[PDB]
Design a protein around this motif. Structure first.
Motif, mmCIF file in Angstrom:
data_model
loop_
_atom_site.group_PDB
_atom_site.id
_atom_site.type_symbol
_atom_site.label_atom_id
_atom_site.label_comp_id
_atom_site.label_asym_id
_atom_site.label_seq_id
_atom_site.Cartn_x
_atom_site.Cartn_y
_atom_site.Cartn_z
ATOM 1 N N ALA A 185 0.813 -1.207 0.000
ATOM 2 C CA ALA A 185 0.000 0.000 0.000
ATOM 3 C C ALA A 185 0.851 1.263 0.000
ATOM 4 N N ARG A 186 2.169 1.088 0.092
ATOM 5 C CA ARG A 186 3.114 2.209 0.104
ATOM 6 C C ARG A 186 2.758 3.272 1.146
ATOM 7 N N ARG A 187 2.369 2.836 2.336
ATOM 8 C CA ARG A 187 2.035 3.793 3.385
ATOM 9 C C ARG A 187 3.284 4.412 4.018
ATOM 10 N N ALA A 215 20.736 10.809 -0.094
ATOM 11 C CA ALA A 215 20.916 11.508 -1.351
ATOM 12 C C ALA A 215 20.361 10.571 -2.418
ATOM 13 N N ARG A 216 19.992 11.136 -3.564
ATOM 14 C CA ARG A 216 19.502 10.360 -4.703
ATOM 15 C C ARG A 216 20.568 10.520 -5.783
ATOM 16 N N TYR A 217 20.795 9.474 -6.567
ATOM 17 C CA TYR A 217 21.808 9.514 -7.621
ATOM 18 C C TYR A 217 21.196 9.664 -9.004
ATOM 19 N N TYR A 218 21.869 10.423 -9.859
ATOM 20 C CA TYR A 218 21.424 10.624 -11.232
ATOM 21 C C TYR A 218 22.625 10.447 -12.144
ATOM 22 N N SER A 219 22.406 9.838 -13.301
ATOM 23 C CA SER A 219 23.500 9.628 -14.232
ATOM 24 C C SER A 219 23.748 10.936 -14.959
ATOM 25 N N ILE A 220 24.941 11.500 -14.792
ATOM 26 C CA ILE A 220 25.255 12.775 -15.421
ATOM 27 C C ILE A 220 25.037 12.687 -16.929
ATOM 28 N N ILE A 262 21.293 16.728 -15.604
ATOM 29 C CA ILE A 262 20.482 15.629 -15.096
ATOM 30 C C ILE A 262 19.248 15.427 -15.979
ATOM 31 N N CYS A 263 18.931 14.166 -16.269
ATOM 32 C CA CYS A 263 17.737 13.792 -17.033
ATOM 33 C C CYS A 263 16.943 12.914 -16.065
ATOM 34 N N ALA A 264 15.776 13.385 -15.631
ATOM 35 C CA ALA A 264 14.995 12.624 -14.659
ATOM 36 C C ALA A 264 13.490 12.603 -14.902
ATOM 37 N N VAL A 265 12.842 11.544 -14.428
ATOM 38 C CA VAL A 265 11.394 11.423 -14.549
ATOM 39 C C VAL A 265 10.810 11.613 -13.152
ATOM 40 N N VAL A 266 9.812 12.486 -13.042
ATOM 41 C CA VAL A 266 9.180 12.742 -11.748
ATOM 42 C C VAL A 266 8.336 11.557 -11.297
ATOM 43 N N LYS A 316 4.423 11.173 -3.791
ATOM 44 C CA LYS A 316 5.289 11.960 -4.650
ATOM 45 C C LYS A 316 6.741 11.683 -4.289
ATOM 46 N N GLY A 317 7.546 11.356 -5.299
ATOM 47 C CA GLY A 317 8.954 11.075 -5.066
ATOM 48 C C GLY A 317 9.637 12.287 -4.475
ATOM 49 N N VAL A 318 10.434 12.069 -3.436
ATOM 50 C CA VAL A 318 11.114 13.164 -2.756
ATOM 51 C C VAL A 318 12.043 14.014 -3.622
ATOM 52 N N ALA A 319 13.087 13.409 -4.183
ATOM 53 C CA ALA A 319 14.033 14.182 -4.976
ATOM 54 C C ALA A 319 13.487 14.765 -6.275
ATOM 55 N N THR A 320 12.706 13.984 -7.015
ATOM 56 C CA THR A 320 12.200 14.475 -8.288
ATOM 57 C C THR A 320 11.200 15.621 -8.183
ATOM 58 N N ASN A 321 10.322 15.592 -7.192
ATOM 59 C CA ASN A 321 9.371 16.697 -7.068
ATOM 60 C C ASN A 321 10.063 17.953 -6.534
ATOM 61 N N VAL A 361 22.490 0.465 -14.307
ATOM 62 C CA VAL A 361 21.071 0.192 -14.144
ATOM 63 C C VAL A 361 20.591 0.401 -12.723
ATOM 64 N N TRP A 362 19.298 0.679 -12.588
ATOM 65 C CA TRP A 362 18.704 0.927 -11.283
ATOM 66 C C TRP A 362 17.224 0.576 -11.270
ATOM 67 N N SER A 363 16.637 0.593 -10.076
ATOM 68 C CA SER A 363 15.217 0.302 -9.903
ATOM 69 C C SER A 363 14.521 1.521 -9.299
HETATM 70 C C1 FAD Z 1 23.336 4.639 -9.950
HETATM 71 C C2 FAD Z 1 21.939 5.243 -10.131
HETATM 72 C C3 FAD Z 1 21.671 6.144 -11.211
HETATM 73 C C4 FAD Z 1 20.350 6.733 -11.419
HETATM 74 N N1 FAD Z 1 20.208 7.595 -12.504
HETATM 75 C C5 FAD Z 1 18.933 8.124 -12.679
HETATM 76 C C6 FAD Z 1 18.760 9.029 -13.806
HETATM 77 O O1 FAD Z 1 19.646 9.364 -14.593
HETATM 78 N N2 FAD Z 1 17.430 9.530 -13.954
HETATM 79 C C7 FAD Z 1 16.349 9.271 -13.182
HETATM 80 O O2 FAD Z 1 15.240 9.738 -13.379
HETATM 81 N N3 FAD Z 1 16.532 8.434 -12.115
HETATM 82 C C8 FAD Z 1 17.770 7.854 -11.833
HETATM 83 N N4 FAD Z 1 17.943 6.996 -10.731
HETATM 84 C C9 FAD Z 1 16.732 6.773 -9.876
HETATM 85 C C10 FAD Z 1 17.014 8.031 -8.891
HETATM 86 O O3 FAD Z 1 18.232 7.952 -8.031
HETATM 87 C C11 FAD Z 1 15.778 8.076 -7.865
HETATM 88 O O4 FAD Z 1 15.537 6.794 -7.221
HETATM 89 C C12 FAD Z 1 14.437 8.491 -8.498
HETATM 90 O O5 FAD Z 1 14.657 9.768 -9.145
HETATM 91 C C13 FAD Z 1 13.352 8.595 -7.560
HETATM 92 O O6 FAD Z 1 13.615 9.363 -6.386
HETATM 93 P P1 FAD Z 1 12.581 10.126 -5.614
HETATM 94 O O7 FAD Z 1 13.334 10.715 -4.464
HETATM 95 O O8 FAD Z 1 11.878 11.166 -6.430
HETATM 96 O O9 FAD Z 1 11.615 8.930 -5.277
HETATM 97 P P2 FAD Z 1 11.415 8.300 -3.914
HETATM 98 O O10 FAD Z 1 10.694 9.202 -2.958
HETATM 99 O O11 FAD Z 1 12.677 7.707 -3.419
HETATM 100 O O12 FAD Z 1 10.466 7.199 -4.250
HETATM 101 C C14 FAD Z 1 10.806 6.098 -5.147
HETATM 102 C C15 FAD Z 1 10.050 4.814 -4.813
HETATM 103 O O13 FAD Z 1 8.646 5.028 -5.080
HETATM 104 C C16 FAD Z 1 8.046 3.766 -5.472
HETATM 105 N N5 FAD Z 1 7.286 3.933 -6.743
HETATM 106 C C17 FAD Z 1 7.487 4.684 -7.890
HETATM 107 N N6 FAD Z 1 6.498 4.542 -8.850
HETATM 108 C C18 FAD Z 1 5.630 3.649 -8.262
HETATM 109 C C19 FAD Z 1 4.371 3.032 -8.665
HETATM 110 N N7 FAD Z 1 3.771 3.289 -9.868
HETATM 111 N N8 FAD Z 1 3.810 2.155 -7.736
HETATM 112 C C20 FAD Z 1 4.297 1.815 -6.513
HETATM 113 N N9 FAD Z 1 5.472 2.335 -6.028
HETATM 114 C C21 FAD Z 1 6.102 3.255 -6.953
HETATM 115 C C22 FAD Z 1 9.161 2.704 -5.479
HETATM 116 O O14 FAD Z 1 9.120 1.895 -4.255
HETATM 117 C C23 FAD Z 1 10.380 3.595 -5.685
HETATM 118 O O15 FAD Z 1 11.511 2.895 -5.190
HETATM 119 C C24 FAD Z 1 19.266 6.374 -10.468
HETATM 120 C C25 FAD Z 1 19.552 5.470 -9.384
HETATM 121 C C26 FAD Z 1 20.818 4.922 -9.211
HETATM 122 C C27 FAD Z 1 20.966 3.975 -8.024
#
Ligand code: FAD
Ligand code: NAP
Ligand code: FMN
Ligand code: CA
Length: 604
Positions: free
Chosen positions: A355-357, A385-390, A403-407, A419-424, A602-604
């Motif tokens: 439930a991602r609570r 910290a969050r990592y991004y591929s330069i 940085i190229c990122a998806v919110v 909402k993702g912490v770093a991207t928003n 690669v990453w998840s």
């Molecule tokens: C070596 C490395 C390089 C990277 N390079 C890049 C890059 O170039 N560009 C880029 O965009 N990102 C990249 N990432 C991913 C990046 O570091 C962050 O994890 C990502 O931007 C999300 O962070 P956040 O703080 O916004 O999200 P967070 O607040 O950390 O939340 C992310 C989490 O939300 C959950 N989530 C997301 N979508 C869903 C869904 N539909 N349903 C359920 N749960 C979901 C997952 O559990 C996910 O792990 C990289 C990661 C690593 C380890």
């Protein structure tokens, strides 16, 4: 003290738990195991191996019932974390007799990577080779499944083994820190979100790294896609005068801030004045970890910059919170979630994880839960910290990191919008001044030493990131009048008119002649999926010729499925045209990896 053994004697500990950690997970596990010791009449301490000399392991027998445990995470290419490098190097060069040493290892890894739990496996294997006695089997934690459940399951069996071997037996929630409210402090002595040294964000002095991030100005922040559906962005961070260096392939790490709205809601539901400035001090006066985060600081600042309030909590947090739920049904629900199996485990994986609570959601759905904010601040993990591929080449942009990122934004089963912490936070940065705390982390992902060597780049979605930099560099090389080999990009998106990143830039690079081929797979423009591996297969003849000739392959993006499917496709290319068996093609591709000719980001 330099000898951890002497430190143990002086402080009355018989168990020491070393952690190899980069983003704090292993450290937390080590701390949790250390605290468990007391339940068995033992005493433990957690320790950062880098602060000590592991050669002192041979002295452990001087302490009665001595036991050493290692919680080690594996990173880049099956290597140790930075803080465990010296230990790793020592293990490779030593041949000391560790007879009499009793140990256990819990490895933190992720099965989507090539070298799964390589560090934990190595430490466990080496200690036995050196003569030490394994007390309990190697733990193989897998973050691709549920690392927490792997940990509590291993932890339970581990202590049973400790009780059996050492003849000890199991015997209320114990705070690690105590609260001190700083009602009369100078505004200038209060941390406001900086890491490490007080005022280090305001007074910027090199060298800049993880402990001293450089505040880079956001010179650019532009939307890369069309729909209002998803948001993909391109940012450019000014690193002028930071002395920071990088190369295409490196990662840029950023320290984000939590959503102000989320923090405010937490403050309200907790009935706490977030502007109160305080300090949390370690009750163990001999520990080097005096506070859980920079102090003194306000609760607002801690929740905004220092604590993780968005990740689904691990089981120990839920177990400790249970004591503050006045409704019986609610209190029982929380306590049960620490179970390694049964309904308690099912509920944890479903109610919390699936439930991602996050913490606010848990406090909202268990309204009788009203914990004191200071204890909550002690329980929550540190915001990482969050990592991004330069996405830029330092040959073209030596003073900027792109940085190229998806919110990240989605709806949960619990009816919320996460909402993702770093991207928003990054999305909200207005281009010039908005500052982003960052630092560069070197990687092994690199263009070939010889410009003539061809490169095959596979990166769908944001996986295209490092390749934008690669192409910039190869173009630069050609402009320097150097002979450059073929440069091929296999990219992919859902629809050409919705999420095709850098469409115009890539097209121009191809017209210029820098990008030899631009191969794009549009996955949702047909009934069936069309992916990059489909294009690779179609191009098998040319790709094999390049591979055979010495070309370098690079794969970036999704690790769970894309990386595996692409690797399998290359196995087939080699097996089919190399005229060898599948198993031989597998060995072939894995050998390319060892030679630095098949690289992954690669990453998840
Ligand atoms: C070596 C490395 C390089 C990277 N390079 C890049 C890059 O170039 N560009 C880029 O965009 N990102 C990249 N990432 C991913 C990046 O570091 C962050 O994890 C990502 O931007 C999300 O962070 P956040 O703080 O916004 O999200 P967070 O607040 O950390 O939340 C992310 C989490 O939300 C959950 N989530 C997301 N979508 C869903 C869904 N539909 N349903 C359920 N749960 C979901 C997952 O559990 C996910 O792990 C990289 C990661 C690593 C380890
Ligand atoms: O960055 P981002 O997350 O925003 O990227 P993303 O859009 O999730 O994905 C990038 C591209 O990768 C495709 N894709 C999905 N699973 C794949 C697999 N197993 N192998 C190869 N390609 C795959 C996607 O197609 P689909 O999303 O249509 O599966 C999409 O076209
Ligand atoms: C850049 C990076 C590389 C990784 N490489 C590997 C790897 O080769 N093998 C593996 O099993 N796990 C790998 N992992 C997964 C981590 O080991 C796992 O997430 C671990 O929980 C991290 O622990 P930490 O928070 O203590 O640093 C990697 C994670 C990152 C961010
Ligand atoms: Ca083509």
């Amino acid at each position: 003290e330099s000898s951890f053994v002497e430190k143990m004697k002086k402080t009355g500990r018989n168990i020491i738990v070393f952690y190899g950690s980069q983003t704090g997970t292993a450290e937390e596990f080590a701390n949790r195991l250390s605290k468990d010791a007391h339940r068995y009449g033992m005493r433990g301490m957690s320790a950062d191996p880098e602060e000590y000399d592991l050669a002192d392991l041979s002295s452990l027998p001087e302490i009665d019932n001595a036991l050493v445990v290692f919680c080690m995470a594996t990173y880049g290419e099956g290597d140790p974390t930075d803080n465990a490098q010296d230990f790793y190097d020592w293990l490779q060069e030593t041949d000391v007799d560790l007879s009499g040493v009793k140990f256990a290892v819990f490895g933190l890894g992720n099965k989507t990577y090539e070298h799964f739990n390589a560090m934990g496996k190595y430490v466990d294997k080496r200690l036995e080779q050196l003569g030490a006695q394994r007390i309990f089997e190697l733990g193989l934690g897998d973050d691709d499944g549920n690392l927490e459940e792997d940990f509590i399951t291993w932890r339970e069996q581990f202590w049973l083994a400790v009780c059996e071997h050492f003849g000890v037996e199991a015997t209320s929630s114990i705070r690690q820190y105590e609260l001190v409210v700083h009602t009369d402090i100078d505004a200038a002595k209060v941390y406001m979100g900086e890491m490490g040294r007080l005022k280090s964000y305001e007074n910027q002095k090199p060298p800049f790294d993880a402990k001293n991030p450089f505040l880079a100005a956001v010179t650019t922040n532009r939307k890369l896609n069309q729909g209002t559906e998803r948001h993909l962005m391109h940012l450019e961070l000014d690193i002028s005068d930071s002395k920071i260096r990088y190369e295409s392939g490196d990662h840029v790490a950023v320290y984000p801030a939590n959503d102000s709205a989320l923090v405010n809601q937490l403050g309200k539901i907790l009935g706490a004045d977030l502007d109160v400035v305080m300090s949390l001090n370690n009750l163990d006066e001999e520990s080097n970890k005096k506070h859980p985060f920079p102090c003194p600081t306000s609760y607002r600042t801690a929740l905004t910059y220092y604590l993780d309030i968005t990740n689904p909590p691990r089981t120990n947090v839920l177990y400790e919170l249970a004591q503050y739920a006045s409704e019986p049904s609610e209190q029982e629900l929380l306590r049960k979630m620490a179970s390694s199996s049964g309904e308690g485990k099912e509920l944890y994986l479903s109610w919390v994880v699936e439930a991602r609570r996050h913490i606010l959601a848990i406090l909202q759905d268990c309204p009788s839960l009203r914990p004191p904010i200071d204890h909550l601040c002690e329980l929550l993990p540190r915001l990482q910290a969050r990592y991004y591929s330069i996405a830029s080449s330092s040959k073209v942009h030596p003073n900027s990191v792109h940085i190229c990122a998806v919110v990240v934004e989605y709806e949960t089963k619990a009816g919320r919008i996460n909402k993702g912490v770093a991207t928003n936070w990054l999305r909200a940065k207005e281009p010039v001044r908005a500052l982003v705390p960052m630092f560069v982390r070197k990687s092994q992902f690199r263009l070939p030493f010889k410009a003539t060597t061809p490169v095959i780049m596979v990166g769908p979605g944001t996986g295209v990131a490092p390749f934008i930099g690669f192409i910039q560099e190869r173009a630069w090389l050609r402009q320097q009048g150097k002979e450059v080999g073929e440069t091929l990009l296999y990219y992919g998106c859902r629809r050409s008119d919705e999420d095709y990143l850098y469409r115009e830039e890539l097209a121009q690079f191809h017209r210029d002649g820098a990008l030899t081929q631009l191969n794009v797979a549009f996955s949702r423009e047909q009934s069936h999926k069309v992916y990059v591996q489909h294009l690779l297969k179609q191009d098998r003849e040319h790709l094999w010729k390049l591979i055979e000739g010495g070309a370098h392959i690079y794969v970036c993006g999704d690790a769970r499925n894309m990386a595996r499917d692409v690797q399998n496709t290359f196995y087939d290319i080699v097996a089919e045209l190399g005229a060898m068996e599948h198993a031989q093609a597998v060995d072939y591709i894995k050998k390319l990896m060892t030679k630095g000719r098949y690289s992954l980001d690669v990453w998840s």
